[PDB]
Amino acid sequence: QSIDQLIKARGKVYFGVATDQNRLTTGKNAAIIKADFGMVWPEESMQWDATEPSQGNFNFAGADYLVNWAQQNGKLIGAGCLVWHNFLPSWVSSITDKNTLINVMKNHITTLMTRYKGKIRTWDVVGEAFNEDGSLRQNVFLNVIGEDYIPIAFQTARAADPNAKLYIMDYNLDSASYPKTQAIVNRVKQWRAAGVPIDGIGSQMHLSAGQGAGVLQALPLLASAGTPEVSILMLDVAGASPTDYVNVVNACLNVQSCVGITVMGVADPDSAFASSTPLLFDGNFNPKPAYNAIVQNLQQ
Numbered sequence: 001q002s003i004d005q006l007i008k009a010r011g012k013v014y015f016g017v018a019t020d021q022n023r024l025t026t027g028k029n030a031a032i033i034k035a036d037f038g039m040v041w042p043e044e045s046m047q048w049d050a051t052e053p054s055q056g057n058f059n060f061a062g063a064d065y066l067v068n069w070a071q072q073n074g075k076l077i078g079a080g081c082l083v084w085h086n087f088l089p090s091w092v093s094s095i096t097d098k099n100t101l102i103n104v105m106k107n108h109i110t111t112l113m114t115r116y117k118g119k120i121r122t123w124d125v126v127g128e129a130f131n132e133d134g135s136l137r138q139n140v141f142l143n144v145i146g147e148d149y150i151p152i153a154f155q156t157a158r159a160a161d162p163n164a165k166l167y168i169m170d171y172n173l174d175s176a177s178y179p180k181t182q183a184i185v186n187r188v189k190q191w192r193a194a195g196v197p198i199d200g201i202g203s204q205m206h207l208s209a210g211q212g213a214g215v216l217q218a219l220p221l222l223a224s225a226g227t228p229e230v231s232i233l234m235l236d237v238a239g240a241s242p243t244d245y246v247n248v249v250n251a252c253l254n255v256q257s258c259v260g261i262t263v264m265g266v267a268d269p270d271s272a273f274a275s276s277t278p279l280l281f282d283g284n285f286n287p288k289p290a291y292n293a294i295v296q297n298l299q300q
């Protein structure tokens with residue numbers, strides 16, 4: 001049974017997965033993605049160091065492959081991340097001049113989004129912008145541009161492709177009482193009030209065991225920021241307990257603005273956290289109990 005088909009039947013948009021050319025050309029990954037998932041994300045081929053390893057010298061080979069494969073197989077596409085501190089070449093983080101860095105960031109955003117204009121449902125524009133206490137993370141963009149880099153990034157992205165949904169995303173938004181969760185809600189509220197085009201908040205749910213229960217309260221709190229959409233991203237769960245996975249799916253179903261869920265990978269041995277067996281398929285590419293529990297929850 002396809003969890004994407006079943007979640008669509010319940011009124012959601014997709015059940016998605018992160019992948020790339022390396023996975024799609026090996027094992028049973030392509031067959032499972034074709035059958036069970038409705039949306040794909042490039043894990044690395046759209047990050048800054050992959051796409052602009054030197055300033056103004058772009059590399060789209062891996063991203064083109066993923067986009068073409070998705071279109072050929074009738075899948076939605078999400079992509080990212082345009083602006084964050086991971087996957088960032090040294091030539092960017094060494095820039096000290098505000099005007100220079102603004103133009104560099106705008107060019108990076110505009111070039112990627114223009115190339116795939118109209119083909120991408122969701123762009124993760126800004127990622128991991130917050131510290132755990134709710135203050136803004138001191139990356140090169142904050143250091144050099146200041147807090148205006150977030151409004152600028154979204155305004156630039158909206159101008160490049162008005163069809164795409166623009167997201168801010170972060171991790172450790174899984175508890176309603178945690179300062180980071182409350183901080184991103186308050187800030188996104190202010191940004192939207194000022195007209196910044198933030199269409200969604202994406203929650204990067206790299207979860208410890210037992211954290212699914214808290215998502216039932218955190219996800220509604222994230223929805224209260226008033227963005228058109230919220231999404232669950234990078235989902236995996238240490239131990240892959242059905243109890244955690246079913247709680248995450250129920251939180252999605254309970255929040256009307258939550259459009260779908262994206263899991264971090266297909267099969268455990270391909271996870272960066274493989275030893276914690278945190279995905280929905282095992283090393284033999286067989287569905288695990290958590291996968292069956294999601295299917296059964298969505299049928300009922």
Ligand SMILES: O=[N+]([O-])c1ccc2nn[nH]c2c1
Nearest residue numbers: 018080081124233234262264
């Ligand atoms: O949901 N995702 O698995 C995911 C993976 C990588 C990304 N980069 N930007 N947004 C992303 C989402």
